[PDB]
């Protein structure tokens, strides 16, 4: 009972968790529940690999399932970690199963950081182990036959799968054993042996000789093709080649022998003899040439008896001419076997440790989408603010709308009064003064954090250097200096930001001292404010004039244009679409994810009404500014230039400008403060890293 089986590949143990957990934490919340399960999966995973590949080799279905499970799990991980770029480097080291090499030596090894390589080797071991479990089965027993058939077919499919994937899975050339041609040959050997098992079942079940001859002939055809492949390319262990040659002949003989019984039953006595002679010749050759590998004594006796009996009857009774072999018809062929497809899960009762984990492809698309969503939202918002800023600057330069509200040059025009009261309510000048005052204190807070952080590093390093200098033998560690270069690289960037923040401060400060006085005036109680605003004569051309009403409507509309910008900006910021589903659908429905066309399409649907309206604001303002510009210069002819009115106009213009300045200043300062406050949160984290690292030392 000699069946071919394949030996398991050897691999060196590697740390599975490490590069996995490293990535895990990089991509999730510290202490966050992710780690809680994911890191616990990557742990159980490494133990699996060791169990599936480190263990001494056990021909136990339990041991085979563990290997199958490991192939399943390993496959289930590919989408959920960024192996492709390979910045994620975990290296897999396997040895050739057969100690085969293109160059002359004993054994050839190969370490690759390609999960594709790992996958092929695991599957190979799955195939090889299955082939060993099959070769051990008791074939005089129905269960043994079922088990042997199933495993040989599994092995056949696994090997063939390896053949079809191996090269795409690998950058460089494979070790021989898993090379496409080696695994193609093994695949066919496994299939032949499965066909053999069905021939034995057929025999044991005493099926018709017609069937048995066809099953056996199909086996012959399988073993014969495998033989041919091996005939000029010796990449399998030494006993494989002779065994194939033997099994090819034995299966041919079986086919002849059963076909001869059929001939006999049809009174084709000459054919019967010719076929039994072919069978005797085949089995005779096997007995002497491959006795090292097979035992055909019982079969040889059986043939011999059938031939002697047949020659007797023919020589005395039938007198039938014995045909030449070339004149006989082919025995047909019937296959009952198929290479089993590898579709994970190939293990029983599988459960993907990382099923919850989100496919890398989708996160790459979610991140991408957000860089697009930010750009859309920020862009439109900035477009709107710059436009509003531009128009306020234009209206002030024209004394609008003050000029139209100033019917009596005696009193504070209503729009100035509204603005005054608005500012006073917002705290007045105190508001600005306070923000300005503590700007330098927020800077100082941050410098201090940064400085203390770097001092930690400096101090420890200082003792590290001393210790190495005095205790060379006893103090041998990577020098703190080396270890700290990364954190000090952060340090220098932080420092670069702070240098810029200082400049941003100096700019806002200078701009604040350049407008403080006029803002102080704006904030006076109304009578005191009126008293400081030079009076002038009015002109009745104010009451009912056309230019005034035209200008007023233009101004009212422009006002509606800028008040609308508030709701638009807020609607821009308050909405969002979670794109996870859209990406997962694309990925399950399809093989790949193209976010660009997807992002664009969803963005357009979520933000398109708004982005459109924003664009209308801008063009609408444009129209308005040209119109008021022309209408004013006309309104200008109407009014009269004297030093009194000139002086009033200068103060009104300056008062409107002071309102806009107060608005901008408060906003630029609160943006400054937020920056310093957020920078403190980051510097506090940075300071912890420095503490941690100085104390792990």
């Amino acid at each position: 009972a000699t069946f071919i089986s394949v030996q398991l590949k050897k691999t060196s143990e590697v740390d599975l968790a490490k590069p996995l957990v490293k990535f895990i934490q990089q991509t999730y919340p510290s202490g966050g529940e992710e780690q809680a399960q994911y890191c616990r999966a990557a742990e159980e995973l490494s133990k699996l690999r060791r169990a599936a590949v480190g263990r001494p080799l056990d021909k136990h279905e339990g041991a085979l399932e563990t290997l199958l499970r490991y192939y399943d799990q390993i496959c289930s991980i590919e989408p959920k970690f960024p192996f492709s770029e390979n910045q994620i480097c975990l290296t897999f080291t396997w040895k050739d199963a057969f100690d085969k090499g293109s160059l002359f030596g004993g054994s050839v090894k190969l370490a690759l950081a390609s999960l594709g390589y790992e996958k092929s080797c695991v599957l190979f071991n799955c195939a090889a182990l299955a082939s060993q479990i099959a070769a051990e089965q008791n074939l005089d027993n129905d269960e043994g036959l079922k088990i042997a058939a199933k495993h040989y077919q599994f092995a056949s499919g696994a090997f063939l799968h390896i053949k079809e994937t191996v090269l795409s899975a690998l950058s460089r050339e494979p070790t021989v054993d898993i090379s496409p041609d080696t695994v193609g040959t093994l695949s066919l050997i496994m299939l032949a042996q499965a066909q053999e098992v069905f021939f034995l079942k057929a025999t044991r079940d005493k099926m018709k000789d017609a069937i048995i001859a066809k099953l056996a002939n199909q086996a012959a055809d399988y073993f014969g093709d495998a033989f041919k492949q091996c005939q000029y390319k010796d990449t399998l262990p030494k006993e494989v080649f002779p065994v194939l040659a033997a099994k090819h002949c034995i299966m041919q003989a079986n086919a002849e022998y059963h076909q001869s019984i059929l001939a006999k039953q049809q009174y084709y006595f000459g054919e019967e003899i010719a076929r039994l002679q072919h069978a005797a010749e085949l089995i005779k050759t096997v007995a002497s040439r491959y006795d090292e590998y097979v035992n055909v004594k019982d079969f040889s006796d059986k043939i011999n008896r059938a031939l002697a009996a047949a020659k007797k009857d023919n020589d005395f009774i039938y007198h039938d001419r014995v045909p030449d072999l070339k004149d006989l018809d082919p025995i047909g062929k019937a296959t009952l076997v198929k290479s089993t497809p590898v579709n994970v899960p190939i293990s029983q009762k599988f459960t993907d440790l990382f099923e919850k984990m989100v496919p890398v492809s989708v996160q790459q698309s979610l991140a991408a989408y957000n860089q697009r969503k930010a750009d859309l939202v920020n862009r439109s918002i900035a477009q709107m603010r710059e436009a509003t800023t531009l128009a306020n600057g234009v209206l002030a330069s024209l004394n609008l709308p003050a000029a139209i509200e100033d019917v009596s040059g005696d009193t504070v025009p209503q729009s100035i009064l509204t603005k005054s009261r608005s500012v006073i309510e917002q705290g007045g000048i105190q508001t600005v003064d306070q923000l300005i005052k503590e700007l330098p204190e927020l800077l100082q807070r941050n410098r201090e954090i940064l400085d203390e952080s770097l001092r930690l590093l400096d101090e420890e390093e200082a003792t590290d250097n001393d210790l190495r200098a005095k205790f060379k033998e006893r103090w041998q560690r990577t020098p703190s200096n080396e270890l700290y270069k990364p954190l000090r690289a952060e340090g220098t960037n932080f420092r670069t930001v702070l240098d810029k923040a200082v400049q941003a401060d100096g700019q806002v400060k200078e701009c604040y001292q350049s407008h403080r006085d006029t803002i102080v005036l704006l904030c006076k109680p109304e009578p005191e404010l009126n008293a400081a605003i030079p009076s002038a004569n009015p002109a009745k051309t104010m009451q009912g004039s056309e230019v005034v009403n035209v200008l007023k409507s233009l101004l009212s509309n422009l006002d509606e244009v800028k008040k609308e910008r508030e709701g638009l900006e807020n609607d821009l910021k308050s909405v969002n679409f979670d794109m996870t589903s859209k990406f997962l659908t694309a990925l399950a429905q399809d093989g790949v994810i193209n976010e660009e066309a997807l992002s664009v399409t969803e963005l357009d649907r979520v933000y398109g009404g708004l982005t459109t309206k924003v664009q209308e604001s801008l063009k609408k303002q444009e129209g308005l500014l040209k119109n008021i510009q022309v209408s004013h210069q006309e309104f200008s002819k109407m009014k009269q230039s004297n030093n009194e009115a000139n002086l009033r106009e200068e103060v009104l213009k300056n008062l409107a400008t002071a309102y806009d300045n107060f608005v901008e200043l408060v906003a630029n300062l609160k943006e400054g403060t937020k920056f310093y406050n957020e920078l403190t949160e980051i510097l506090v984290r940075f300071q912890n890293k420095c503490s941690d690292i100085v104390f792990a030392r």
Binding site: A504, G672, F675, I682
Partner: peptide, 15 residues
């Protein structure tokens, strides 16, 4: 053009 624009951008980059 806003004094803290660039500095605010540098911050996100890191945070």
């Amino acid at each position: 053009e806003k004094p803290y624009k660039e500095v605010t951008e540098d911050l996100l980059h890191l945070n």
